């Protein structure tokens, strides 16, 4: 809707230039038409367009070098003119001549003393999926993005401050990484770091964060610009001796796995929604860390948590398959050939001190339940926190001592068991299968359960109307509509045997309909779900160890934020005694090929 | 952990050179800084690093030719200096100058009379997956591996003994095969066999075993260096007449299928854990043998064993489906609507001489059981040896004459039957299906049963808590927890019909949970196993006849070690009468294309 308002504003600008004789003469450089229009008669030069145009902006935008030469004699001060409002705010013609790769008015605007500190604070320049581009505010940032090297160099030779920022806090190095051209923009990164002359006594342009606190090295990791990222590692690495085909290189390891303000590089690789930024994990200075971090101190510290969780659920259940549950001494003959039960769940009979051992084993879960919430005072926490509710619920179900106690118990038990699926990630060749289950359910099945619920609410609603006629004493598959859904559900998954009596005849509309149910659902709708399962399985295993590797890291940093020090040293060997400084290093070796 | 100790030692060497002014001057060839440091003042030259450095080692290692020229005037005897300890033991600068492909100090070290017999016995040179390289001890072996031909030739012209060995017994030909460059290293194999001048009266360098007894021809087969292997067959073959497009070539067949110390080449191709070394079996002098060895004398000798095994198991079942087993005259009414039985297994009633024919047929298995153990006094022996236990167990179950006799009987029978799966390998287009079953179970299923046991110990543990309430007289799927696992197990494999009564109402938490069991397991967890089956099936049949060919050979040599001679001639025709010698040959023909 706003883009239409961008388009409604845009054509109004075209109708505006169509009516003004100056700006329509500013479309094409008809200089003989201009000098009759400009030099002879007295025309105002502040003819504003639909959003703040001048003729000086138009000839700069439609590549009229020669027409703007006439404009410089007539307009000495329209260089000092920003574009006005609502898409272009603070844009001048110094920006515009840069965007069209040159004009040599570029040289003439500075010969008329243009302002290179002009900030393009418009909406149509701000970072958005609405704009198809993003180049910041300053024309120096407009210079570096379009890959025009000498045009950049001219701005250095007129005082364009490299250390400028946008509203987002992004400097000119941050804009170069955000461009979709990756190799084509990498050469500017070397040229613009040739002009980092002083550094302003701290962070010499390569460590300056934005408003959200992002160095361009880490932001390169966030966007996953892999080609740029290898080029920034060339600066970071500091090679030691080389031994023929061997190279004892030494990566720097400074912003990777800190405990800083954003706590890592690695979590920022995880917590973005950009799927493609996880390609960095195959790159060797990061790939070596997460293998070393997981091999020693990662994997056995995980399984030591994993061994505790198995003994927890076995204990639970041991205190959940043994339940008090007297024989039925209460109200007897309420099930008149009807809802059967005889246990009724003992009130406070906590005698027989085998039950005191059970009372010990019950308290093992309860104390362990509080620990999980003492962890989680702030896709698998949603298992274990909902595990932590139901253990607390089933004790409140015992302190109040109500009746409906199995209904939180069954949520508690199977999610307690199915949460050790999460522990199968640290047992390699079992990792991404848990990723596969998440890919089936929230990726394919929940956008397919809307298809199965259509069919199943037809036939179950159908069969209730067919078997409204019959005595459900024979053929009790559809005695009522609530279980009719459940009864059709496993005919749909080929479990219930198919309702057939053979003592009496069936009604005639049943035989057609349940046969039509068989064709449309038993072989067809079921197997088309299986091919969706069979499609995504081949999608995962073709990228297997990748999503295994992404599983390890996000597990690892999550383990670090909830485990203290003095049991975990920060990986990579230290400095200051081997004599480089507080930067902590790790080395890696390679053959040439 | 040791690699960190390699890295902790490595940076300490960097801090060591950082503090010493001589070695830091030995980093870059600042000769004007050196002559003030060396020629003017008196500096010791035995400045040892963190593991035994000299400045003579450093300039040799960081490619300072000119700095080492100053070192030769100052240090006449540091050429005679090995690297000291714990990674580099016995390494001198004569080794180091070789590794950097030249220095012409290479010529000058021998001009200072360097020792080419120096043995690099360090840990960081020994064969390991910790080291990324392996080049032995002697610098002649360091010369040939880096593919520097004239630098090799210089060592011949100063007395480098080619016949030297490492601690492993590997000569210089063994190192050339172990390099990952295959074509790039093959040219050294011709050049170094140009200098096998005498041969030391026996094994002229091409038949010298190591400490584990490996000729380089056979070791080429063990590592599967296929490109090198074809080049070694060029030496072995001895071509006869050629007839236009025909070529009556004649491969040598000496170390392939011996009865020597390592009993073959072929078993060594099998019993390595290297999967890729079985690529040799497609190469034509070996591919022709195993086809000829299996076509005649391989296949019908296998099926003659296979015909015996079928009549064995048929005579096994014949004395196992007829069992003595009286009617129940003993304790009657112990199953109070409970565990039923009426046979109780007769003690010693061996009358009715039809049973004596059974007593004959029982002794057929027992004698045949001892033969299998008389074979196996020292993945399918584990079938037949466990077959051999249970037949012995079921006779000890008869001599003691105990009761629990069917429990070893059922292990005995189905593994007796399923061991003739192994006999389907010699019946082409049935071979690799038995390989597929091993690929499913130990390759995919046992790294997936840990996933199924998670789900199945939830829901079976769940349903026991749901159906703790109910009378199990109706709906006896879950009367107890031990059979509750078995009852959920075939709901998981879509066998048991789904527990549904329709006389009474079911408990409410059942209907949700068993429906949730249906979604997560019946279509989802089951079919994702099937796609794993459907993945590896396409992996096997794409490489079908390969793993069929590997199946034949490992079957064949296993048949040779347990069958004597005078029924098996060693294949390939003989010599000494056709006039070449004791080497036994086989010929093969080919069109040009």
Author numbering:
A (entry chain B), B (entry chain C): 28 to 405, 424 to 638
Can you quote the paper on this entry?
We thus turned to human TRPV6 (hTRPV6), of which we recently resolved the open-state structure by cryo-electron microscopy (cryo-EM). In order to increase the affinity of hTRPV6 to 2-APB, we introduced the Y467A mutation, homologous to Y466A in TRPV6*. As expected, hTRPV6-Y467A showed 4.5-fold increased potency of 2-APB inhibition (IC50 = 60 ± 13 μM, n = 3) compared to hTRPV6. We determined the cryo-EM structure of apo hTRPV6-Y467A, which is in the open-state conformation, and it is nearly identical (RMSD = 0.765) to the cryo-EM structure of wild-type hTRPV6. Lipids are observed in positions similar to those seen in hTRPV641; lipid 1 is bound in a pocket formed by the intracellular half of the S1–S4 domains and C-terminal part of TRP helix, while lipid 2 is above the S4–S5 linker and contacts both S3 and S4 of the same subunit, and S5–S6 of the neighboring subunit. In both hTRPV641 and hTRPV6-Y467A, the activating lipid head penetrates this area to interact with Q483 and R470.
TRPV6, a highly calcium-selective TRP channel, is overexpressed in endometrial cancers, leukemia, and carcinomas of the breast, prostate, colon, ovarian, and thyroid. TRPV6 has four subunits that form a transmembrane domain (TMD) with a central ion channel pore, an intracellular skirt domain enclosing a large cavity, and amphipathic TRP helices that run nearly parallel to the membrane and interact with both the TMD and the skirt. The TMD is composed of transmembrane helices S1–S6 and a re-entrant pore loop (P-loop) between S5 and S6. The first four transmembrane helices form a bundle to constitute the S1–S4 domain.
